[PDB]
Design a protein around this nucleic acid. Sequence first.
DNA 1: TAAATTTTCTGAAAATTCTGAAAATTATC
DNA 2: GATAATTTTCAGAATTTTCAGAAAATTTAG
Lengths: 254, 262, 261, 261
Amino acid sequence: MATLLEKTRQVNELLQKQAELPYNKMAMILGDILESNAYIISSSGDLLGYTEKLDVNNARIKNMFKEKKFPQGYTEAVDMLKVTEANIPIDSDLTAFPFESRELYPFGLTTIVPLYGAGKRLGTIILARVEKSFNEDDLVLAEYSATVVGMQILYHQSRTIEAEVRSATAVQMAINTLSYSELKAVHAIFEALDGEEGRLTASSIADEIGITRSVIVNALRKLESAGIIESRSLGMKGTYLKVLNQQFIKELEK
Amino acid sequence: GAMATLLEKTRQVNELLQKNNLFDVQAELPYNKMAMILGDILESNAYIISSSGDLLGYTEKLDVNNARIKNMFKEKKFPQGYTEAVDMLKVTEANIPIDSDLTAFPFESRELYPFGLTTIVPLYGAGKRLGTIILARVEKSFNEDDLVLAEYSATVVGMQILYHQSRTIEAEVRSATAVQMAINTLSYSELKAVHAIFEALDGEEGRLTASSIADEIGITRSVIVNALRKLESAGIIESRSLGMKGTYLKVLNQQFIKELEK
Amino acid sequence: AMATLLEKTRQVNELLQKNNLFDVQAELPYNKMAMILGDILESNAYIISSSGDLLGYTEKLDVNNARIKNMFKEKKFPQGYTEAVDMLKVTEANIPIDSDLTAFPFESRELYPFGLTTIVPLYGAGKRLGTIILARVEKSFNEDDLVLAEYSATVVGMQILYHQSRTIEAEVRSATAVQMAINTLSYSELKAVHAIFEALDGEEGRLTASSIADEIGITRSVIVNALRKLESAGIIESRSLGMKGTYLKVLNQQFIKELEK
Amino acid sequence: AMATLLEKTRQVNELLQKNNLFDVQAELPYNKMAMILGDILESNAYIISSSGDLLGYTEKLDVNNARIKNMFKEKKFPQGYTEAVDMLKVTEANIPIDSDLTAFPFESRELYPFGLTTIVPLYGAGKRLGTIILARVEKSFNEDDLVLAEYSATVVGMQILYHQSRTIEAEVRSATAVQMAINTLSYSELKAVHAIFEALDGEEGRLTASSIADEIGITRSVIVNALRKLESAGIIESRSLGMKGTYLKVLNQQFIKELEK
DNA sequence: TAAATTTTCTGAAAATTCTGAAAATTATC
DNA sequence: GATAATTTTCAGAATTTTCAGAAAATTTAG
Ligand SMILES: CC(C)C[C@H](N)C(=O)O
Ligand SMILES: CC(C)C[C@H](N)C(=O)O
Ligand SMILES: [Mn+2]
């Protein structure tokens, strides 16, 4: 019982202290207290984290790990489990152990634990071990981590959607204020500007498309105001441009 | 089994976390909803306070003093002494007796609950002390598994507090940054024109004649239009042309008039 | 047994010609198709949505529960039974009477002990559009009956998908039209439309435009120009009654929405 | 043989989901539907319209190379064969080589003496929408094969009917818009519209509206208001270029037609 | 026919988008 | 610093735009 409390404290410090799929590292944390390999999948099937703590046989695993994508079939199979399942044998297709070697670990047992945020399935955790099976304390720890990770996923996803919605509203609000010639100039300049940042000469392109140089300057200022870009004058070397809002080039090409 | 009951209790709290997040609600005692569940699952009285003492949730399921204690619940503020006493403990301290000053039971009525037991758990949402949970029970003691469950509840509540504060901080800072970024793109004459225009408007919205102000401050009429357009781009204002009646303006960003006068 | 199957599939194909011509005021569109399917299968047939809203039915056999007749009248199946059948991914046939997915009343479970039931789900794109329920006294469903059942299931599924896609696209096009209209009104014109249709307080009627214009401090001609810009986009239908005022009729239903927004 | 038939019908039902869209700007949209049908029946399959336009095909087996390839490339079957199959009215199967309705080339008839072919007509709302043609060497079509063939036939028939209904409805909406808009312009506004779009001499461009207004003795406000009435109905897209005039773009293609009328 | 409205057409003050010269800016040598 | 090549600020005008305002034109009841 004391060790259980210690493990819960270990995980509390660990997890609490764009992350580029952090959960992989987080999986290691979950493994340590349970001394087992861990896998984490989303509701769509996209792999979001894994840790091969024990002596695995690489192969498709090495790749599914490298490619950051689990086999579509197994991931779409676990999504319907609804509630927790424990001590699943090796002969079952729901096993975490690679089937390439089922004779190597017949004693292995595996577990599936679903993740739920605000009442919707956010993902699933998978654990696997040998010799002794998962008892209740291990399930307590598993669901502890499940709920914590559920809330972290919900937080990151809500923040990301809010960010993209604000950025898209900004882009639309800005483009709806540009004039005809200003919009043509924006198209021309950002078509010449290969990439999100660089340097170019605005007056030359302005002469190439038949628009007065001041109109282009004013357009770039209307964009700077709404934070879509950040312009800086290089004098005789031209103007330097950097795109801050990422939803801009898409709505422009559209 | 002790472990079986523990697992069942953790599941009972998980199911409420799923549907009762109530993330839209930011009303007085947001977590009190969270407090009720914890009081029931432990079959004990529960209180939730901030590091300063502001009450955020409570449940007097069992027999309480009420006469002198109800004043704290109604005013939603615990006594400064007890809160500053719980602030001294770094880590969890459980099965505290009544003779200790850390007791959750009333000092008015101490002989009514001679065997009463109480537990105190500090809260650290972001590795920083945000508050503390207080539990109180009669005779039945706290074993190890219940401590696991208590710290479970502490950790869950931490992130809800973290979000409640983070959203507003980011929102207000975003509002101020928008105005700063917009004003930093106007030229000297354009900025002077904005100052003149919004001092002449004297309101959150209204109507005026831009050409008149332009002639009054010695700036070309087109510069005012262009400046208001630079503001429209950033969603700071909403301008509408009324032709012979002038221009209509509406201030969307509330941090704008403030950043101008300063 | 196979020739009769082909004949029945052809008999269902033949009726699609006349059934495609539909009237929304019938309140029971697929009912015709339900009768057809009941007839070739000599069985009770029901068609429900994913939520339980009834879309078609036929009482070949006796239900002996005035409680079920009401279900037909109210055009709503019990939410519990619908939520039980909604979980079925694929077709299930020859369902006994003891099962809760049975179409028979719980009053009469021993009254029709041999009764069998079949459930066929309807799908389109990646979502469930509804469900078909078949029920029989003693006689069982064989494989050929299931072939015919799924034939009808697919036909009705795609007809439902088309009707709903048509409705959705129509209303979204109408809403884009309204937005395009308000984006051309001026400040005073937009305020004027608000005033007039708030004073109209209905879907159609008659009023005096000059009075309202004077009441809100706007020139009378501005009202005319705004309402004409609305008529141009087919959003309304205005006609001048001279000294009796103007008559207005709202054609586009998505208009009041863009105003209230 | 009934279970096997049910299995085949279930796999094709599973395939109906995949399409999951209706823009379908493809050269031979039903070609996908043809491929599936070709595989399950292990026979060559062709899908043509009532006029002969090819809509989908799969040449699994040997067919003439030179002249028959032009039918696939040009996407048009010979007028004689199409008008011969349009007369069939009902399904006919196991058609020998001596019949003119044969799917095999008449150049190479001595290569495939036993080849058989089947024709299935497509019907929407009592109208022939097209025809499916199937061809096998030696092996014949049984009753279950016809059940499956007509199963696919009805699906493709309703898909054709839906796409065609959408095309007609779109053009009718476009035609109604121009008349509904022009019926709201006044005399002077109509004169201005005529003058401006005769001056534009094209589908899009730039001009000076005030100049034209003075040139025909009409107030500039009339032109602005008329172009606003047109913008409201999405007939055009105007944008102000200030000192450079007004920019115009014609969205509705039936507009210039109704003006020249 | 006459009141009682609704449309049409004219006028004018203002707003707006664009050209183009004078002034500030950065950079190279 | 000196000079070239840009960027930016600033003044201006042709045009567009919106609204106000009096005829005309239009129904309805008479
Ligand atoms: C279709 C339903 C009315 C049947 C169900 N067994 C009931 O009696 O409620
Ligand atoms: C092309 C075939 C489908 C028709 C006909 N048998 C011919 O050879 O032209
Ligand atoms: Mn006049």
